[PDB]
Write a protein that binds this DNA or RNA. Structure first.
Lengths: 121, 390, 467, 46, 54, 67
RNA sequence: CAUCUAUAAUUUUGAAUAAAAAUUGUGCCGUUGCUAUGGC
């Protein structure tokens, strides 16, 4: 898929899914395509993780428009099943959004991974 | 057939809305119809007989209940209807219909009637009830049933007898108690003793200690039975369990110093220690509980303690059997744990016995002696035992 | 009449049996057999049937079950004591009746008889939960409703053959009798997020290590129905647990990718981390394909008291020794990569070449997940499983530095939730049943539902040995 | 109540259909048809 | 109420490390992450039980 | 709920004073402060010595409790 | 857990029913034969 342009390599996926898992435990994370779109319109999203093997790809390809329109970093990971396991819900999630909060224990990791994604863009 | 059924239910309706010389002749005719019948039409006929019975008992009772018995849930419900509507006459009905009885469903109906009667004076109802008890034990003797079935029946008759005697006042069935003992000691009669002693233990536990004069009536033939046991004429493990358990309950419940009497005391003590001689390895805990109860009852009297200790060391003499030795050892352990204070004076009559037992080779008895007896006696004395045992 | 003489009599009959079996084998040896029957106690792998097995004719038998989503299986196998000499089982009406206990997401616990190695597992008895066991307070320590009310998730049968203990997402842990399946005791985990994920009895004892999902590992004692201890130290959910005859249990926690070995009486632990890198593997292979990163360590089994194998989620099967922190021998994607998604399904666009361009070739490949992994204890083979529809039997070397694929078994189809092996026969002639609880979904979450031909059931595969 | 259920269900499937039809050059009656079949199975469930 | 691993801490100036920061949780003695409710709750419950008894 | 768990460390066989000296870790959750009498009975059962031989002293409960 | 009982097996009597001794692979549907496998 060339439409999934920024696709993470292995180590980048590992870092991203670890940050997603910590953000889910702290509950700084919003799961699902519609909930991620709502967070983006609210302007409270830190950054966007999407799946790549979603069936099909357009139903979340609607997101990069809003993503760089409000200038939010976004990334694609290969497996929506991996994304669901990392989010910590029993169903495969195709798009998750780390929100913004600075009274948060994982601010440093969030900023590191967001910087690395932005460099990949 | 259907015309007869319509006649029956029409009588049901018209008597429900509703004479006795026109009311008992249809009862006789209904008896005749029931005995003539005794096929689905016949079943519904039986149902209609029972409903007309239900109406008349709502608003020859022996034969009525006879047909009610021999004629399922409908039967149980109409039994309850009988007993809420209608009792000494009912008890006479129970006895006569039981002599008529002696199958299984009729037996269950009979027992349900009995339990309903007792949960529903009693001095007047007593002798018919006790004759019914004896007749049920004779049924246990001669029934063509299975063991678990008759044991279900015996458990039911035991619990209803406990309820009835509990309802009864205590001074008035005293001669009835004497005649019950007379029936029990005068079927192979081992079953008589068995049922009577189940009954007696349950009564002793329920009434809790006002059975002392009844055991005063009882003490001689039970001593004859204990002597039969120690001579090993009988062998009934459960009967011996029952005798010893009754004796325990009486000893532990006597709070009137009744067992401070010397003659009864020496009788029961001699019989119990010889029972320890002829004991069997299952009932040993029962017998050591018995001897501990006897000692805790006669704790105040030193000569009683002395003859107790003499009998026990006589039976734990080192030249004896392993089981008798070990059970006497457990009895001594229990006694010294319980009383422990009226026995230090008796203690120097027992160290040579301990020495020979420790020297014995059967390491079960050796370990039992060492651990149990020496640790409980060392704890009683405080400072250790190795100044007596050199 | 003396207990020492009774022990001597049983030992003399045992020696008669040993000499007779030595003669029948002949149609040194007895000393080696005695040293073996003791050498179970030392912590070194000795059971060396790594090449006597005949996998190519291992007879497979699927048994479909009624309920949905079997979650775990644990099979009780009676053995003989060497100290006393009666048996492992309790009753006399059992006499070595191989039993199996299966727990399933339908809240159903079921005991099968598996005593015969030719016929199918016969369903002896069962007990089902439901919603009538929901606690009335719901906000308290008291959770002791006699049944299960939500998602039982692990079972384990005690070695004495009296109890079997089940635990699930309802944060209780119930010990049931083995005959009537009656619940004799119920222990709440007393925690809001303390869901019980995996149990493991200490072998030939009654201590039970119950890896909960609140980052802690509770240890109990079933003969007294008590909770001895709580062990702390994992940074994610303590996913899987395994223990042997010693006072150690190895636990793998998933997202932290960490295997920790708990020495219980020393009250200490050892931490093992993985750490392979795609750049190092790529440069090393250039010095010589795909290299998947390590997401999470899913399952563990202790092969021996100094070595254990961890099946990760990214195809890795590692073998670790207690001396070296890094894995002494890794093994790459062990059940293959997953099949690629369809071009039409991944694009939704008429242009066929654009659909293939969506599929991208290699970049969207993910390896099979080693769902289950069981090392038959103190021995040199172990069974791995994924939803590849194929159990994989592997064999460790003699120097315990590597292992090789001994064989495959293709009768299974679905997610292999739990593998459990049972041996029987005479000491030289030992048949090995391999039960496997197979279900359509994973044990923990759903995450997958489209497996072609996956049916809920017990895959029983009997192997024999000739050598 | 089930009117509101069906309304929200149809709204979500409509949103997904609009996504694929805007970002697919030559869109697919097959995905449209399977999504319609899904909604029809829900309406049969009513 | 709050333990770091196994140890109940009640010092608000404890200066955690990274592993401890992952290990912080409620304590097993407390009514919050564990055992029986406090004296206020169970005294209120005893009061309501006696008031329903009368 | 409650089961006192005794473990011993640093077991030094000291044959000069004819003894075995160790360090006793007691775990008593949902409880407090098991007795020296109970510890001596249990250590006698473990080590197969007599309660008159066993001696213990110097116990210290940790903050929070349970050990 | 043991005992007892129950179902199911032999024995004897009777052509046999009958009598008693006495003893000791699925929740739903699908293909498919004398067990194997589809889908929900």
């Amino acid at each position: 898929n060339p439409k999934a342009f920024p696709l993470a390599d292995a180590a980048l996926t590992q870092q991203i899914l670890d940050v997603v898992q910590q953000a889910a435990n702290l509950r700084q994370l919003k799961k699902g395509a519609n909930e991620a779109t709502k967070t983006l319109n609210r302007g409270i999203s830190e950054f966007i993780i999407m799946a790549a093997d979603c069936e099909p790809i357009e139903i979340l390809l609607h997101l990069p428009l809003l993503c760089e329109d409000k200038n939010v970093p976004y990334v694609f990971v290969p497996s929506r099943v991996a994304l669901g396991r990392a989010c910590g819900v029993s169903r495969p999630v195709i798009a998750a959004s780390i929100t913004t909060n600075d009274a948060s224990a994982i601010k440093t990791q969030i900023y590191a991974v967001k910087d690395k994604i932005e460099t990949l863009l | 057939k259907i015309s007869s059924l319509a006649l029956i239910t029409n009588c049901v309706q018209v008597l429900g809305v509703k004479f006795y010389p026109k009311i008992v002749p249809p009862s006789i005719k209904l008896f005749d119809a029931s005995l003539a019948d005794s096929n689905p039409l016949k079943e519904q006929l039986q149902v209609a007989i029972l409903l007309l019975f239900a109406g008349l008992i709502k608003r020859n009772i022996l034969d009525v209940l006879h047909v009610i018995y021999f004629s399922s849930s409908i039967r149980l419900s109409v039994i309850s209807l009988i007993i809420e509507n209608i009792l000494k006459e009912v008890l006479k009905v129970l006895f006569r219909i039981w002599s008529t009885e002696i199958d299984t469903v009729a037996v269950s109906l009979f027992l349900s009637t009995l339990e309903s009667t007792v949960e529903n004076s009693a001095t007047s109802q007593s002798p018919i009830f006790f004759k019914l008890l004896l007749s049920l034990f004779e049924f246990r003797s001669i029934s063509s049933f299975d063991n678990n079935t008759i044991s279900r029946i015996e458990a039911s008759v035991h619990e209803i007898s406990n309820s009835y005697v509990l309802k009864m006042n205590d001074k008035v069935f005293r001669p009835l108690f004497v005649i019950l003992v007379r029936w029990a000691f005068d079927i192979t009669e081992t079953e008589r003793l068995l049922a009577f002693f189940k009954f007696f233990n349950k009564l002793q536990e329920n009434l809790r200690g006002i059975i002392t004069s009844y055991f005063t009536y009882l003490l001689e033939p039970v001593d004859m039975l204990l002597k039969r046991f120690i001579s090993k004429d009988m062998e009934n493990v459960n009967l011996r369990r029952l005798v010893i358990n009754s004796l325990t309950s009486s000893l532990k419940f006597d709070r009137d110093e009744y067992w401070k009497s010397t003659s009864r005391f020496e009788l029961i003590s001699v019989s119990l220690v010889n029972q320890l001689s002829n004991i069997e390895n299952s009932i040993g805990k029962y017998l050591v509980k018995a001897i501990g109860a006897l000692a805790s009852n006669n704790s105040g009297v030193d000569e009683h303690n002395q003859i107790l200790n003499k009998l026990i060391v006589e039976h734990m003499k080192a030249s004896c059997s392993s089981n008798e030795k070990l059970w006497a050892i457990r009895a001594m352990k229990l006694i010294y744990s319980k009383i422990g204070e009226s026995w230090l004076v008796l203690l120097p009559q027992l160290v040579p016995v301990i020495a020979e037992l420790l020297e014995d080779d059967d390491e079960e008895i050796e370990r039992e002696v060492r651990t149990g007896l020496v640790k409980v006696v060392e704890n009683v004395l405080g400072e250790p035992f190795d100044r007596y045992l050199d | 009449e003396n207990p020492a003489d009774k022990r001597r009599r049983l030992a003399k009959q045992y020696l008669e049996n040993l000499k007779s079996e030595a003669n029948d084998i002949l149609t040194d040896i007895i000393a080696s057999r005695l040293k073996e029957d003791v050498a179970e106690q030392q912590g070194r792998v000795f059971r060396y049937f790594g090449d006597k097995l005949l996998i190519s004719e291992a007879k497979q038998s699927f048994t479909r079950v009624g309920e949905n989503n079997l979650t775990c299986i644990s099979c009780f196998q009676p053995v003989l004591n060497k100290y006393t000499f009666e048996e492992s089982s309790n009753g006399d009406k059992n006499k070595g009746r191989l039993f199996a206990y299966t727990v399933s997401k339908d809240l159903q616990l079921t005991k099968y008889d598996i005593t015969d190695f030719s016929k199918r597992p016969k369903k002896l008895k069962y007990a089902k939960g439901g919603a009538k066991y929901i606690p009335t307070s719901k906000h308290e320590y008291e959770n002791t409703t006699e049944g299960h009310y939500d998602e039982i998730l692990t079972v384990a049968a005690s070695p004495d053959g009296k109890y079997v203990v089940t635990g699930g997402r309802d944060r209780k842990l119930i010990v049931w009798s083995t005959e009537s399946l009656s619940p004799v005791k119920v222990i709440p985990t007393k925690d809001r997020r303390g869901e019980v994920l995996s149990l493991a009895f200490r072998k030939n004892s009654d201590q039970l290590y119950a890896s909960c999902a609140d980052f802690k590992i509770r240890t109990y004692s079933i003969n007294q129905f008590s909770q001895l201890e709580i062990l702390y130290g994992h940074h994610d959910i303590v996913e899987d647990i395994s223990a042997l005859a010693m006072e150690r249990c190895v636990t793998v926690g998933a997202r932290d990718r960490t295997a920790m070995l708990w020495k219980i009486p020393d009250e200490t632990r050892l931490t093992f981390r993985g750490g392979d890198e795609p750049q190092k593997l790529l440069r090393r292979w250039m010095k010589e394909p795909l290299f998947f990163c390590e997401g999470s360590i899913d399952v563990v089994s202790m092969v021996d008291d100094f070595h254990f194998i961890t099946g990760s989620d990214n195809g890795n099967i590692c073998l670790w020794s207690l001396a070296k922190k890094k894995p002494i021998f890794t093994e790459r994607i062990a059940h293959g990569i997953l099949p690629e998604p369809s071009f039409n399904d991944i694009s939704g666009e008429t242009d066929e070449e654009l659909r293939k361009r969506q599929l991208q070739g290699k970049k969207l490949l993910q390896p099979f997940w080693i769902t289950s992994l069981y090392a038959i204890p103190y021995s040199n083979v172990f069974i791995s499983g994924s939803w590849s529809g194929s159990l994989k039997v592997w064999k460790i070397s003699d120097n315990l530095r590597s292992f090789e694929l001994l064989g495959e078994l293709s009768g299974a189809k679905g997610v292999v939730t739990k593998i459990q092996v049972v041996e029987s026969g005479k000491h030289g002639k030992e048949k090995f049943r391999i039960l496997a609880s197979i279900a359509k979904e994973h044990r923990l979450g759903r995450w997958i539902a489209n497996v072609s031909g996956a049916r809920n059931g017990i895959y029983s595969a009997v192997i024999d040995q000739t050598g | 109540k089930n009117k509101g259920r069906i309304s929200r269900y149809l709204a979500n499937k409509c949103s997904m259909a609009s996504r694929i039809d805007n970002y697919s050059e030559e869109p697919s009656n097959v995905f449209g048809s399977v999504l319609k079949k899904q909604v029809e199975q829900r309406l049969e469930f009513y | 109420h709050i333990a770091v691993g196994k140890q109940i801490v009640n010092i608000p100036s404890f200066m955690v490390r990274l592993d401890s920061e992952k290990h912080i949780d409620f304590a097993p003695t407390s009514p919050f992450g564990g055992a029986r409710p406090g004296r206020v709750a169970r005294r209120n419950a005893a009061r309501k039980a006696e008031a329903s008894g009368e | 709920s409650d089961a006192v768990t005794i473990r011993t460390r640093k077991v030094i066989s000291n044959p000069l004073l004819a003894r075995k000296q160790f360090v006793v870790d007691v775990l008593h959750p949902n409880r407090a402060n098991v007795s020296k009498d109970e510890l001596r009975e249990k250590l006698a059962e473990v080590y197969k010595a007599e309660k008159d031989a066993v001696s213990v002293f110097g116990f210290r409960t940790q903050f929070g409790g349970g050990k």
